[PDB]
């Protein structure tokens, strides 16, 4: 204080909704519903949302609004022994920027690709095609669809790479798209939230315009009801299995943003007596509701593919990049006015990703802006240096073998790491700092204590929720592979480095902080577990 504040509350809400709603709302939630008993999946999903996701989501938002600092300073002021959590969270967000932007660039690349009266990925008689190409998805690996070969052999040129050891030529048309993304991010974030919170009005709202248009074209298609059937038809037999609850737990956790320091930074610009609890609920709800909607958008079209284009539903119903960059564009191309559906689809994909990259970077800038007045004074300079380091290292993912690089980070950069970070975040808040202090902090802000429900969830449910995900994510571990390629053991260990490079800050910094403090070790856990709020009276 003085600390800059949101130019208006809608800016905050859209920044948060924009961060939380991204591509996985489209390319994973509907797939999980289809795979796990249809609308029955909503039960495990809703329970995980209620006892795990939203409480963690609420917590970080309240915590950021109360302590009014970014992730490093905040965790340091709250429990100095764990200042490292702020460092861990910061460079997890740092790694994620190295690859996640590439998805946006692919979106722009397909967008620039659809300025035409006849979409390229339609047919199997192009220079990049293979003797084995089919018009649509099949179930035999050696025979790709026309859209799959376009993505793979034309956009990516992934066929020309023999692995992560063979990144090949830089692909400048991609680097151009990667640069445009970073320019859009720079001129969105250099001036701070005064413009960043205005930009999100587009990037957070645009997808809903397109979701509506596609939802109508989708549901008017022949076979669209058949798709909705595959999407939502209940089968509670799935609920019996542990793997389904783990799928719900993990989806809930990664879909909401909790513990990345992003919600922390955004809430840190809230007015102190803002009703952060009302904001956390409205915001959670919109995230999940968007996934629900998008599922109709996807499977109406997926149903139209099965009914009309003559393809097994199981072959087109898929997750991840393949759904949005291959299967959906395939369906679009068969439709009248296809060029229009393609241009707004790929635009939606990019705006879906942009709000999210915004939040990741802001978690970083705000964290560093608060630790270091040097960079806070020079924001417009600092981000330019940061996005420059992004663009340069990111050129690796614009190479012909670039997917192999993307896929490596996508697995190791944030996955296992953030779960342990958030696990200590929960443990720090509820048990070191105390739910008592926290509840009291929340009342001083919003006028009432959190219910015993939110308290039980933070203290008990949350940590074993995160524990539940982390353990099944270990027991299910296998060495990294993509399609027929298997990554070399050194590549595997290198990702373990990226994974532990951040997690290690937690015990590292705890060890280093102990060795600058005067007293005996009973005396020293106390000096490092006493909150900054209390030392200053």
């Amino acid at each position, epitope marked *: 204080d003085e600390r800059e504040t949101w130019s208006g509350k809608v800016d905050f809400l859209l920044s948060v909704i924009g961060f939380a709603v991204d591509l996985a709302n489209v390319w994973r939630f509907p797939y999980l519903c289809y795979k796990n008993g249809g609308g029955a999946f909503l039960v495990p999903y809703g329970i995980m949302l209620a006892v795990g996701g939203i409480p963690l989501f609420y917590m970080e938002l309240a915590l950021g609004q109360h302590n009014r600092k970014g992730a490093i300073t905040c965790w340091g002021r709250l429990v100095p022994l764990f200042k490292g959590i702020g460092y861990a969270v910061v460079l997890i967000a740092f790694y994620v920027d190295f690859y996640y932007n590439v998805i946006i660039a692919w979106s722009l690349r397909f967008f620039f690709a659809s300025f035409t009266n006849s979409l390229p990925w339609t047919s199997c008689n192009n220079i990049w095609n293979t003797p084995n190409c089919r018009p649509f998805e099949g179930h035999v690996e050696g025979f790709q669809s026309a859209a799959s070969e376009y993505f793979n052999r034309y956009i990516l040129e992934l066929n020309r790479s023999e692995g992560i050891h063979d990144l090949g030529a830089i692909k400048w048309d991609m680097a151009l798209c990667l640069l445009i993304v970073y320019l859009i991010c720079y001129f969105s974030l250099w001036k701070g939230i005064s413009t960043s919170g205005k930009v999100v009005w587009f990037t957070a709202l645009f997808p809903y315009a397109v979701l509506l248009i596609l939802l109508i074209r989708g549901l008017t298609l022949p076979g669209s009801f058949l798709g909705i059937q595959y999407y939502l038809t209940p089968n509670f037999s799935a609920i019996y299995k542990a793997e389904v609850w783990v799928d719900a737990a993990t989806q809930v956790f990664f879909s909401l943003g909790p513990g990345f320091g992003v919600l922390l930074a955004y809430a840190s610009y809230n007015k102190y007596h803002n009703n952060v609890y009302k904001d956390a609920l409205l915001t959670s709800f919109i995230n999940s509701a968007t996934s629900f909607i998008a599922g109709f958008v996807i499977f109406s079209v997926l149903g139209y593919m099965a009914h009309t284009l003559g393809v097994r539903i199981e072959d087109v119903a898929t997750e991840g990049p393949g759904l949005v960059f291959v299967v959906y564009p395939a369906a679009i191309a068969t439709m009248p006015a296809s060029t229009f559906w393609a241009l707004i689809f790929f635009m939606m994909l990019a705006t879906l990703g942009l709000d999210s990259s915004f939040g990741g970077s802001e978690a970083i800038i705000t964290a560093l802006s608060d630790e270091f007045p040097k960079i806070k004074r020079n924001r417009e300079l600092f981000v330019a240096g940061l996005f420059s380091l992004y663009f340069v290292v990111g050129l690796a993912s614009c190479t012909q073998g670039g997917f192999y690089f993307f896929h490596l980070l996508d697995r190791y950069a944030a996955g296992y790491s953030i779960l342990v970070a958030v696990f200590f975040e929960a443990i720090a808040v509820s048990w070191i700092y105390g739910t*008592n*202090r926290f*509840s*009291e902090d929340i*009342r*001083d802000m919003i*006028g*009432f*204590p959190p219910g015993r429900y939110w308290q039980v969830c933070w203290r008990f449910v949350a940590p074993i929720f995160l524990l539940f995900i982390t353990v099944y994510g270990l027991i299910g571990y296998e060495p990294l592979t993509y399609a027929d390629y298997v990554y070399p053991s050194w590549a595997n260990a290198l990702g373990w480095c990226i994974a532990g490079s951040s997690v290690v800050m937690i015990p590292a910094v705890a060890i280093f902080k102990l060795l600058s403090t005067p007293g005996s070790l009973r005396q020293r856990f106390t000096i490092l577990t006493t909150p900054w*709020r*209390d030392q200053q009276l």
Partner: antibody
Amino acid sequence: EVQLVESGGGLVKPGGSLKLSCAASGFTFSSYAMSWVRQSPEKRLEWVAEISSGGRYIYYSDTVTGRFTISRDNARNILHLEMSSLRSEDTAMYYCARGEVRQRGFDYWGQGTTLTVSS
Amino acid sequence: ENVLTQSPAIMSTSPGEKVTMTCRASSSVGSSYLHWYQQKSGASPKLWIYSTSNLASGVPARFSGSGSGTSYSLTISSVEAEDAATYYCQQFSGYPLTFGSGTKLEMKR
């Protein structure tokens, strides 16, 4: 059930000082913020100070700030108002009042204890 | 400091009659932050209506409360002699917390 009992009031010369106390019982005293509210002989109600459930957030009316000090003993369940350089304007019945939720008000009150400041 | 002025100051009413009394703040008060207390002669105040409309525990249905912004009111639909007391309104929308100036309710006979 819930019961609050103020004590310690009495005659005091101006500039003098005195310590009121409120004995909470019948509920979990640690969980609730507490306030002192006074009522002058002219029957006006005037809020004095509020202390957090954990005692970490303290607010004072401008009338008593820098003279009064609100305190909290969560182990023994006793609220405290420590007065000093008292003046005749401080003459009132002092109430101790539960008030953890702002949206819900002061849900329970003591019977009050009377301060009289005179020469 | 958000002054709350109440009128009337004193009020006489026959049992069975409707009674209304008003609270005017010098600044806007969120309706979830406006409350009323009744204080019978010689006794401590009791919480009575909280956040504008909500009857407190044990408060008979005769009572009701309404308002927003800078204007609020207590209404007793059919007065009873046990209802004679002084009513105080209050805000928590901001520190310093402030109480209304009182409406003393009295029995006509």
